[PDB]
Ligand binder design. Structure first.
Ligand SMILES: CCCCCCCCCCCCCCCCCC(=O)OC[C@H](CO[C@@H]1O[C@H](CO[C@H]2O[C@H](CO)[C@H](O)[C@H](O)[C@H]2O)[C@H](O)[C@H](O)[C@H]1O)OC(=O)CCCCCCCCCCCCCCCCC
Ligand SMILES: CCCCCCCCCCCCCCCCCC(=O)OC[C@H](CO[C@@H]1O[C@H](CO[C@H]2O[C@H](CO)[C@H](O)[C@H](O)[C@H]2O)[C@H](O)[C@H](O)[C@H]1O)OC(=O)CCCCCCCCCCCCCCCCC
Ligand code: CLA
Ligand code: CLA
Ligand code: CLA
Ligand code: CLA
Ligand code: CLA
Ligand code: HEM
Ligand SMILES: CC1=C(/C=C/C(C)=C/C=C/C(C)=C/C=C/C=C(C)/C=C/C=C(C)/C=C/C2=C(C)CCCC2(C)C)C(C)(C)CCC1
Ligand SMILES: CC1=C(/C=C/C(C)=C/C=C/C(C)=C/C=C/C=C(C)/C=C/C=C(C)/C=C/C2=C(C)CCCC2(C)C)C(C)(C)CCC1
Ligand SMILES: CC1=C(/C=C/C(C)=C/C=C\C(C)=C\C=C\C=C(C)\C=C\C=C(C)\C=C\C2=C(C)CCCC2(C)C)C(C)(C)CCC1
Ligand code: OEX
Ligand SMILES: [Cl-]
Ligand SMILES: [Fe+2]
Lengths: 31, 156, 33, 92, 37, 76, 333, 135, 28, 34, 450
């Protein structure tokens, strides 16, 4: 619950999902 | 300004559809027909087409082609008599290039088709004999082309 | 108890559809000329 | 040469030198480019503007447009490096 | 365009050309099924 | 311990992940679609590159007065 | 025995200082004649008209060059792809005026390198080895052949091949960038990754093996003296080196098999060089790299630039100034 | 954005103006970049760079070609720069649609859209329609 | 006059290569 | 204005892709000669 | 299970198809299945290309590589190279697609259900990779089939409709080839020609008579060789020089197929007789020659005398002389003076281009063709932009010539790598030291010191 691997993997994983959602949203923007 | 939602259209099915940059539309943004969903133009024989089929311009240009080709083709024996058969080939591929299209576009009755086929075979034989450097055969084939061409002109 | 040859298939499907979506967006929309 | 005094008559001004200007210098005078300018740029040196009308071939039409634009013409000395390229000078 | 009697089948035709690759992928799937014996 | 090879199998792992991940994905989608990123990072909108008055690129020319220059260039 | 049998036994003998073999019969004369011609032409050749516009270019030391700017000029543009041996010129002076030595050197050289690959295989066979070193050597040979022969064939003239000089190489690179937009072709990126990764892995492997040496020398002698010719010791210490590599990065990434390691080492740069050679070969037929010019526009329709547009400006600058007196028409087809 | 003021172009020799509907812009752009792109990409002429498509060259033609009507008329009957001879045999046109098969399926609306695109381009990009490789 | 220097340097390098190849310490 | 082409293409591609693994699963279940 | 695991054969899963070397039943099924896949792709590609056809654009503006072959064979093409109907292409695609199913079923049966080895119940269809007589028999049989195929092409060219001829007197049209050339001097001068510029080796065939005569001679040679290799066995000089195993035969085939791929790519790039320009587009030299011709015509129309106009270097802006004397086009295109196209030959005399014919004998159709070929040069990018590298995004076109050349060149190089690898392994395994160095009897330790 507080192990080093937990912190590392989640700190690398949460922004990844956030950014992937952002990029997928960007894909449908048209000027 | 302070806040606004960017406009969206997914695959062209949900959204605006017409945005000057959509892609993968296959139509669905034009109140007009198309030849196929993969084409930048409409059909040819549509009611709004400017170019008709069988105008006076066609039967003027093709007849001019035919008569000028007859005038040009009347020059082969002078070249053959001088053994200048390279001029014969250059003549057979310089201006006469449009004759195949003109004759095939002016051939409707089956007898015209047969006469055109005979004329094409005669001209091919003449070109082959010119390449092989045979005076008698090429001269006879040139006379053959002349007679067949004038017969086709008279038949039209 | 998924065997270790189906979850990899799901991951492959996810990554291939993401890549395909990115290519399609490259061909259509912003930055498509 | 380093210094050419008649550089403004090559097409950059309202006056055109009949002896050294390229055919592209007549594109700013409507109704003159493909025929009258073509005839002008392919014939011998002119000692004055009045010498242009003596070109053998000039039809009445041409002569009319040249008279219309006569006020913007001049004839200077012939420069061999400029006179040779009066149809294709490498500019596109 | 296809002859008028077959225009309805156009979506299937638009997919046939790529089938020969799915075979190559299926070979790997079959090998993975038996656990890379 | 408890390596990934059987972490990938635990059902509780899967259910909590199915609960959590879509919330993050939708949060990112809404972050882009609302237009809040344009204000957080200052990126111009597709209709904001050129305004009705300024028809050239807005380059910054001063070091210690960049705030006022940017405030002028954005809207004023 | 006969005379032919004795000759064959001498050719294929594994006791000479340098192996000859049957491939050596094609190898040695071609390489020797190429070397002789190259040296003589590099030292004392007259200017060569490369572009066919009667403007010869000096490339030899005796005509006012140094080592950096000297070269052997490619053949003339008027020749094209025609075969131009010595006996086809009215005189040796005319042969030297039109860039004769380039074809001779290139052709005998390519035959020599092909025979080099064959000879490598032949010695591997005669020594009882496994025959896959010439496959690794095939990549530099492929690249050299690609440039020297394939690019002229596609472009239609030997004059577009790479000059045999140092600054000629830079000129070739710059013109190729201007005309084909390399650096945006994925095969070039593959080649760059290949060379960078090769250097990285060479340094890593050397460091790991050198650090894992056992103690046989103490202080007053070079550590190299510990190893003896014919000694038996695997090229690492498993505990120390494996622990170091498993601790430096995550433990899952560590090669405990020498075979797989030394296979990956061989495979990476070779594949990179193969891909970049094929990239050059395909670009020889006018299949250029990615084009991203004026691809971002605002709502109204104006164009917003990117870095690709700056690259395009540099390309235009290079293009408008190369071979200044060689073009007459707007398009460089 | 593409306002209505930007979409207002001259339509007649007198000076009358007309607002192009939003769909016509896209239709004209598509039709142009597909029947004339190969030789007039960017507003230039590749086979004769002396006669471009920028507004200045259009304004100094003999019959004048800086409005929709004159562009449509030219597409129906091409002439030289001084308007003294016909070049319908060496230029695509409705009059010579038999020679050029690409011109056989064009309507009046299509020609109108093409002319509208040609007229609208100088007002959007500016100084880059018919400029060359410098810009 | 520097062509002499360039030629001397190149020939010296070739001589060094020849001596290294043919007059070498035995691997044994 | 519905653009049935994209739906048809997606359905066809999905069916074609699903055909193969279906036969693999069928052969595995029936204790076949995998 | 036995025969499908590493512990019984070696040959781990990533090289599992190497377990079929000595199993002659499953190998047949595998090869038949690959053949069925090839037929399926052919049919599917034909159908896909037919579905997207547009009757206005030329074939080289739509990215087709399959319709052009059928058009050249004389199907649905008219005068000048215009497409009239697409029914025969549909028929060809349907027939290929249907035959693919039979081929695939046969492959599946012979691979999954049939006997593992054929050397126990069908002695006719059996071999040992070392029985030279059987290998020669198989080679002769399939060789006779190849000869029959070549003769079938000849028969189609001569009696069954004819073929499209781009050098025809009056524009390209379908015609019967009634007088094929049979003099062996011409054909075997084509074969024994140098490959450098001006000669071109076999790429340089420039008329249909030579093509038909060559395919005739090839058919005759293949039939004779098939019979010979069927009725004989390898001689003494061949037995002591080759390696007799399956991998050796594979490498032998690989080298030849790589050479064929290189030759086909260069055909596609340079030839314009078997690849008429009305369907594939202009070749590399053709676009530059067209540009020079177009600008010569324009400048002559403006009023210049284009024979004495001096270029920037003093060499001649429009006309000059080739290193042998012929009159050629000026500029940077002096390298492409070997070009021969049906739309230029009207202006060529006994010593190059004709001055008088150039002066007052140029027809408008030649001008139109030159402009088209100038504006459709084979230049493009990976993402299909088209034009020089410093161009902007306006058109979407890459010529099929570039695609064909690049693809089959890539394949040829990699199959040459195949020759090297598979042949080296075959010989090493035949000798008997492909596993490693025998530590007990290391051969190097018993050689005289160096
Ligand atoms: C065999 C020997 C191999 C060595 C070949 C090197 C030179 C190959 C060459 O210059 O090849 C070019 C010739 C094509 O010849 C061209 O052939 C043309 C034929 O066109 C003529 O004929 C045409 C017919 O219509 C048109 O009319 C055209 O206008 C007219 O000019 C012209 O003659 C050109 O001048 C002539 O260059 O191809 C060939 O000989 C045919 C292909 C030979 C096999 C391919 C060679 C192997 C590939 C190169 C090696 C790759 C090595 C790296 C690998 C890793
Ligand atoms: C793994 C790497 C390969 C996968 C690439 C990603 C797949 C999807 C992206 C892609 O491919 O891109 C998407 C394209 C489909 O995109 C369409 O591609 C079209 C291609 O144009 C074609 O059509 C145009 C008019 O139709 C012109 O005729 C033009 O010349 C002609 O090329 C246009 O670009 C359209 O705008 C675009 O939407 O997929 C294609 O084309 C489908 C063909 C891909 C498989 C074909 C194999 C490649 C051909 C062999 C070449 C060997 C390589 C050379 C040697 C090295
Ligand atoms: C007629 C062609 C042919 C044939 C029949 C063979 C036959 C054989 N080869 Mg050989 N080979 C060939 C050509 C051929 N080769 C060529 C041209 C090369 C040069 C690249 C090689 C290089 C080669 C090597 C290096 C080896 C073989 C081996 C073998 C044997 C086992 C092969 C196996 O199990 O594959 C199994 C096949 C696979 C695992 C497929 C892997 C997938 C590939 C790598 C990716 C291909 C990507 C492709 C371009 C498309 C990508 C699409 C994607 C983007 C979706 C077998 C006797 C092996 C051997 O000696 O065994 C004793 C071996 O080690 N071959
Ligand atoms: C053209 C490609 C091709 C072909 C024809 C083959 C063919 C073969 N491989 Mg092989 N292989 C390939 C590619 C290919 N492979 C690649 C790329 C790899 C690397 C991953 C391998 C790795 C490999 C290994 C490791 C082994 C083989 C083996 C075999 C043989 C027996 C296979 C078996 O028992 O099936 C068993 C499979 C099944 C029962 C399931 C598949 C059922 C069918 C075929 C699926 C397709 C049906 C089709 C879609 C429907 C058609 C219907 C029709 C009526 C129209 C067989 C001759 C084996 C061998 O040597 O046997 C002695 C073996 O051990 N292969
Ligand atoms: C190159 C192609 C090829 C070859 C060499 C073979 C060879 C063979 N097939 Mg086969 N087959 C093929 C293609 C091929 N097949 C295809 C495409 C199909 C699908 C229609 C079949 C369907 C098929 C069946 C259904 C059977 C065979 C059988 C046989 C064997 C006996 C044939 C016989 O007695 O005929 C002798 C002919 C002349 C002397 C033989 C090994 C038989 C077999 O082995 O049964 C055990 C058998 O029952 N084949
Ligand atoms: C992914 C694999 C792939 C694909 C899709 C292609 C695709 C293609 N290749 Mg290619 N090739 C490949 C790999 C591939 N290649 C590899 C790996 C090599 C070896 C390095 C080659 C070597 C190669 C050569 C040497 C040639 C091609 C050619 C071609 C093209 C035509 C093929 C053809 O018609 O053959 C058909 C093959 C047959 C055996 C059909 C036989 C038909 C005989 C009957 C004749 C019909 C008759 C006259 C009329 C019937 C009517 C009736 C009334 C009589 C096509 C675009 C050809 C081409 O156009 O070059 C540009 C060509 O010459 N390829
Ligand atoms: C695919 C084509 C092919 C292949 C692979 C072979 C293969 C072979 N031929 Mg052959 N041959 C062929 C076509 C082919 N032939 C044709 C078409 C002819 C007729 C011109 C001949 C006429 C021929 C003769 C006259 C002889 C061979 C011989 C040979 C053998 C040695 C050839 C050598 O090393 O060189 C070898 C088995 C020689 C041999 O060993 O005789 C049995 C031999 O004397 N061949
Ligand atoms: C719908 C199709 C086309 C349109 C609307 C178009 C537009 C125009 C216009 C308006 C002109 C008038 C000259 C001027 O602006 O001063 C012109 C001239 C010209 N166009 Fe196009 N064009 C088209 C197709 C083409 C094509 C495909 C070519 C291919 C080469 C071409 C080549 C030329 C040439 C050479 C001229 C100048 C001819 C001369 O001045 O004698 N055009 N074009
Ligand atoms: C052995 C093996 C393998 C292989 C396999 C194969 C290779 C197979 C093949 C198969 C095949 C190759 C198949 C084929 C099939 C075909 C079909 C199935 C067809 C059908 C068709 C149709 C049905 C059509 C229809 C139509 C018509 C008639 C008209 C028009 C429309 C249409 C088109 C719809 C693998 C690798 C996997 C694995 C291992 C083992
Ligand atoms: C069809 C046709 C044609 C053709 C014809 C012909 C007649 C061809 C031929 C071809 C041929 C006739 C070819 C041949 C080839 C040969 C070869 C390719 C050989 C090779 C060799 C080898 C490979 C060897 C090797 C070796 C050595 C070196 C020694 C010892 C060892 C060994 C044995 C390994 C023409 C063009 C007319 C026209 C078009 C059509
Ligand atoms: C013709 C025809 C048809 C079709 C048929 C066919 C022939 C199909 C089959 C076949 C198929 C089409 C199959 C395929 C499948 C495949 C798949 C889908 C695969 C997948 C893949 C994957 C996903 C992979 C992955 C992986 C793994 C698993 C492991 C290792 C790694 C990797 C990544 C490789 C139909 C019915 C419509 C009818 C009409 C006609
Ligand atoms: O030769 Mn060497 O660099 Ca191939 O691009 Mn065109 O040509 Mn010349 O110019 Mn740019
Ligand atoms: Cl040029
Ligand atoms: Fe080592």
């Amino acid at each position: 619950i507080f192990t080093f691997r937990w912190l590392a993997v989640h700190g690398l994983a949460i922004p990844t999902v956030f950014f992937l959602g952002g990029i997928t949203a960007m894909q449908f923007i048209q000027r | 300004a302070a806040g606004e939602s960017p406009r969206f259209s997914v695959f062209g099915v949900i959204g605006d559809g017409t945005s000057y940059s959509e892609g993968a539309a296959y139509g669905s943004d034009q109140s007009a027909e198309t030849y196929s969903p993969y084409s930048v133009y409409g059909k040819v024989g549509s009611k709004d087409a400017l170019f008709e089929a069988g105008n006076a311009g066609e039967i003027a240009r093709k007849k001019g082609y035919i008569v000028e080709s007859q005038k040009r083709l009347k020059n082969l024996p002078g070249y053959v008599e001088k053994k200048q058969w390279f001029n014969v080939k250059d003549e057979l591929t310089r201006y006469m290039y449009e004759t195949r299209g003109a004759v095939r576009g002016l051939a409707q009755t089956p007898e015209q088709k047969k006469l055109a086929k005979a004329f094409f075979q005669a001209i091919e034989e003449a070109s082959l004999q010119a390449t092989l450097k045979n005076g008698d055969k090429c001269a006879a084939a040139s006379a053959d082309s002349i007679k067949l061409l004038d017969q086709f002109y008279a038949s039209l | 108890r998924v065997p270790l040859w189906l979850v990899g298939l799901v991951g492959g499907f996810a990554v291939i559809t993401i890549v395909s979506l990115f290519i399609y967006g490259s061909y259509s929309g912003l930055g498509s000329s | 040469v380093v210094d050419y005094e008649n550089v403004a008559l090559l097409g950059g001004s309202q006056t055109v030198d009949l002896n050294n200007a390229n055919v592209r210098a007549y594109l700013r005078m409507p109704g003159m480019y493909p025929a009258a300018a073509g005839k002008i740029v392919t014939h011998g040196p002119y000692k004055s503007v009045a010498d242009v009308y003596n070109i053998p071939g000039l039809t009445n039409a041409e002569k009319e447009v040249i008279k219309k634009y006569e006020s913007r013409f001049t004839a200077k000395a012939v420069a061999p490096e400029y006179a040779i390229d009066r149809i294709n000078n490498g500019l596109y | 365009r296809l002859p008028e009697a077959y225009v309805v089948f156009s979506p299937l035709v638009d997919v046939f050309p790529v089938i020969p690759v799915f075979f190559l992928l299926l070979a790997f799937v079959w090998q993975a099924a038996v656990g890379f014996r | 311990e408890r390596p990934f090879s059987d972490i990938i199998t635990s059902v509780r792992y899967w259910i909590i992940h199915t609960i959590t991940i879509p919330s993050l994905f939708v949060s990112g989608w809404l972050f882009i679609s609302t237009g809040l990123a344009y204000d957080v990072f200052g990126t111009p909108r597709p209709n904001e590159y050129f305004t009705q008055d300024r028809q050239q690129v807005p380059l910054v020319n001063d070091r210690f007065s960049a705030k006022q220059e940017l405030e002028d260039l954005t809207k004023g | 025995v006969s005379l032919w049998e004795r000759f064959c036994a001498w050719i294929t003998s594994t006791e000479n200082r340098l192996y000859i073999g049957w491939f050596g019969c094609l190898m040695f004369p071609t390489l020797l004649t190429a070397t002789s011609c190259f040296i003589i032409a590099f030292i004392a050749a007259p200017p060569v008209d490369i572009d066919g516009i009667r403007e010869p270019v000096a490339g030899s030391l005796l005509y006012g060059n140094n080592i950096i700017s000297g070269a052997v000029i490619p053949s003339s543009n008027a020749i094209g792809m025609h075969f131009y041996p010595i006996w086809e010129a009215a005189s040796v002076d005319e042969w030297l005026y039109n860039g004769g030595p380039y074809q001779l050197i290139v052709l005998h050289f390519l035959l020599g390198v092909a025979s080099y690959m064959g000879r490598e295989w032949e010695l591997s066979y005669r020594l009882g080895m496994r025959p896959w070193i010439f496959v690794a050597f095939s990549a530099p040979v492929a690249a050299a052949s690609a440039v020297f022969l394939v690019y002229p064939i596609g472009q239609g003239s030997f004059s577009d091949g790479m000059p045999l000089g140092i600054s000629g190489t830079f000129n070739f690179m710059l013109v190729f960038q201007a005309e084909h937009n390399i650096l945006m072709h994925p095969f070039h990126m593959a080649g760059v990754a290949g060379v960078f990764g090769g250097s990285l892995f060479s340094a890593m492997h050397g460091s790991l093996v050198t650090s894992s040496l056992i103690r046989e020398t103490t202080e007053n002698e070079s550590t190299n003296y510990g190893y003896k010719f014919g000694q038996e010791e695997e090229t690492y210490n498993i505990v120390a080196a494996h622990g170091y590599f498993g601790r430096l990065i995550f433990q899952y990434a560590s090669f405990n098999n020498s075979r797989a390691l030394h296979f990956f080492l061989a495979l990476w740069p070779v594949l990179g060089i193969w891909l970049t050679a094929m990239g050059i070969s395909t670009m020889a037929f006018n299949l250029n790299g990615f084009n991203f010019n004026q691809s971002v526009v605002d709502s109204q329709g104006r164009v917003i630039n990117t870095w690709a547009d700056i690259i395009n400006r540099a390309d235009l600058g290079m293009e408008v100034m190369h071979e200044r007196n060689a073009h007459n028409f707007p398009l460089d087809l | 954005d593409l306002d209505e003021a930007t979409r207002t172009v001259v339509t007649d020799s007198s000076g009358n103006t007309t607002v192009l509907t939003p769909e016509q812009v896209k239709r004209g752009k598509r039709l142009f970049n597909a029947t004339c792109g190969a030789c007039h990409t960017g507003g230039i002429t590749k086979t004769n760079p002396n006669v471009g498509l920028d507004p200045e060259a259009l304004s100094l033609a003999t019959p004048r070609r800086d409005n929709i009507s004159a562009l449509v008329d030219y597409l129906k009957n091409p002439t030289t720069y001084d308007g003294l001879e016909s070049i319908a045999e060496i230029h695509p046109s409705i009059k010579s649609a038999d020679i050029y098969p690409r011109m056989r399926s064009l309507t009046d609306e299509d020609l109108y859209s093409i002319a509208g695109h040609i007229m609208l381009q100088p007002k959007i990009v500016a100084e880059k329609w018919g400029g060359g490789k410098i810009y | 006059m520097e062509a002499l220097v360039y030629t001397f340097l190149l020939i010296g390098t070739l001589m060094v290569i020849f001596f290294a190849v043919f007059f070498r310490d035995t691997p044994r | 204005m519905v653009n049935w082409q994209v739906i048809g293409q997606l359905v066809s591609t999905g069916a074609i892709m699903l055909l193969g693994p279906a036969i693999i699963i069928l052969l595995a279940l029936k204790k076949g000669n995998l | 299970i036995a025969g499908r695991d590493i512990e019984s054969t070696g040959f781990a899963w990533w090289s599992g198809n190497a377990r079929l070397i000595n199993v002659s039943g499953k190998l047949l099924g595998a090869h038949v299945a690959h053949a069925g896949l090839m037929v399926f792709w052919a049919g599917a590609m034909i159908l896909f290309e037919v579905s997207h056809f547009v009757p206005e654009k030329p074939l080289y503006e739509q990215g087709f590589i399959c319709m052009q072959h059928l058009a050249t064979l004389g199907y649905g093409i008219g005068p000048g190279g215009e497409i009239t109907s697409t029914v025969p292409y549909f028929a060809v695609g349907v027939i290929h697609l249907i035959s693919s199913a039979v081929l695939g079923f046969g492959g599946i049966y012979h691979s999954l259900l049939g006997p593992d080895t054929l050397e126990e119940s069908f002695p006719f269809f059996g071999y040992d990779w070392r029985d030279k007589n059987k290998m020669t028999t198989i080679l002769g049989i399939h060789l006779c089939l190849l000869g029959l195929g070549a003769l079938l092409l000849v028969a189609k060219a001569m009696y069954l409709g004819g073929v499209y001829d781009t050098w025809a007197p009056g524009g390209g049209d379908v015609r019967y080839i009634t007088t094929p050339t049979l003099n062996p001097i011409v054909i075997f001068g084509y074969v024994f020609r140098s490959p450098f510029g001006g000669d071109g080796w076999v790429v340089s065939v420039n008329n249909m008579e030579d093509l038909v005569g060559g395919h005739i001679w090839v058919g005759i040679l293949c039939i004779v060789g098939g019979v010979w290799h069927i009725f004989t066995k390898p001689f003494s000089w061949a037995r002591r020089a080759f390696v007799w195993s399956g991998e050796a035969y594979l490498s032998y085939s690989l080298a030849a197929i790589s050479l064929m791929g290189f030759t086909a790519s260069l055909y596609a790039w340079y030839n314009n007789t078997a690849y008429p320009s009305e369907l594939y587009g202009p070749t590399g030299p053709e676009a530059s020659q067209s540009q020079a011709f177009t600008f010569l015509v324009r400048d002559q129309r403006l009023g210049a005398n284009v024979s004495s106009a001096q270029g920037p270097t003093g060499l001649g802006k429009y006309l000059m002389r080739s290193p042998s004397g012929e009159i050629i086009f000026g500029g940077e295109t002096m390298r492409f003076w070997d070009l021969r196209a049906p739309w230029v030959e009207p202006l060529r005399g006994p010593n190059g281009l004709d001055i008088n014919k150039i002066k007052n004998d140029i027809q408008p159709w030649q001008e139109r063709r030159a402009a088209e070929y100038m504006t459709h040069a084979p230049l493009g990018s990976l993402n299909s932009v088209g034009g020089v590298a410093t161009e902007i995004n306006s058109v979407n076109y890459v010529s099929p010539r570039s695609w064909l050349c690049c693809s089959h060149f890539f394949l040829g190089f990699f199959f040459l790598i195949g020759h090297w690898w598979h042949s080296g392994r075959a010989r090493a395994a035949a000798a008997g030291f492909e596993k490693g160095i025998n530590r007990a009897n290391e051969p190097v330790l018993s050689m005289r010191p160096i």
